[PDB]
Design a protein around this ligand. Structure first.
Ligand code: 8N2
Lengths: 7, 268
């Protein structure tokens, strides 16, 4: 699963 | 006069769509809470501003693949940043989600433009420290890429960095293992992650062990030349990574499309 990653 | 110069529209991500009342220019209106600011800096006017404003002003000069700060305001508990807004636009993360792995011709054009934008940052004394597809906007009509969100950046320096607040899955193994890194070679590592992301459809590493493990499995068909560039960018030892010049002289990087060609072939 592809996901965003916060900073 | 803040609410009198811009008509504020809807949330985009706290970033609002807006239009400059002077000339109906599409803008993005970014609010930043003072109480949540990590690094502070100072402009010429002696004013103490968030580092993000300092960095954005340093890269704002002229035309570039970098988002332009058009203005900013200070409020009791926040700063408000007026940024240019391309229209129509899509960030590179949503674009890769929707399209899957990008054709190498398109990835080459995109990656080339990210390289030019990052070189521009470094020329202006700015280290972005959060290069990733989420922080790249695509102007879908012009075929031009724009680097955004300098909220994790620093002044560029040649000595070691021991602080980091960017995206961990794009951070280099020397940050993971030893909580130190140098700016340019760390940037190059994140560009390797980014390039893999473009040609394979997602980033290669999710866990620390994969990051420091220094093995790159290709889940999509990718040319040997492109695999070589990626693996070079992701050398475990920082001094083994290519300079920006070596990246742009790499055989895979030759014969890039112009932005407008990129839009016509691949985006229209
Ligand atoms: C369409 O979305 C945007 C358009 C212009 C700017 C931004 C963010 C820029 C920044 O943080 O520097 C944006 O992201 C929501």
């Amino acid at each position: 699963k592809r996901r965003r990653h916060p900073s | 006069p803040l609410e009198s110069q811009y008509q504020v529209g809807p949330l985009l991500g706290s970033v609002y769509s807006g239009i400059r009342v002077s000339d109906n220019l599409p803008v993005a209106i970014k609010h930043v809470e003072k109480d949540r600011i990590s690094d502070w800096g100072e402009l010429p006017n002696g004013t103490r501003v968030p580092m993000e404003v300092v960095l954005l002003k340093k890269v704002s000069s002229g035309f570039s693949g970098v988002i332009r700060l058009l203005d900013w305001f200070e409020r009791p508990d926040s700063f408000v940043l007026i940024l240019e807004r391309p229209e129509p636009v899509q960030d590179l993360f949503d674009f890769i989600t929707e399209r899957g792995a990008l054709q190498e011709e398109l990835a080459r054009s995109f990656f080339w433009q990210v390289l030019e934008a990052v070189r521009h940052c470094h020329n202006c004394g700015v280290l972005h420290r959060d290069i990733k597809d989420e922080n790249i906007l695509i102007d879908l009509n012009r075929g031009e890429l724009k680097l955004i969100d300098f909220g994790s950046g620093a002044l560029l320096k040649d000595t070691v960095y021991t602080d980091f607040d960017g995206t961990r899955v794009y951070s280099p193994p020397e940050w993971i293992r030893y909580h130190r890194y140098h700016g340019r070679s760390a940037a190059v590592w994140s560009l390797g992650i980014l390039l893999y992301d473009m040609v394979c459809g997602d980033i290669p590493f999710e866990h620390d062990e994969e990051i420091i493990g220094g093995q790159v499995f290709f889940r999509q068909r990718v040319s040997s030349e492109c695999q070589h560039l990626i693996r070079w960018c992701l050398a475990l030892r920082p001094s083994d990574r290519p300079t920006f010049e070596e990246i742009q002289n790499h055989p895979w990087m030759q014969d890039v499309l112009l932005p407008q060609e990129t839009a016509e072939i691949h985006l229209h």
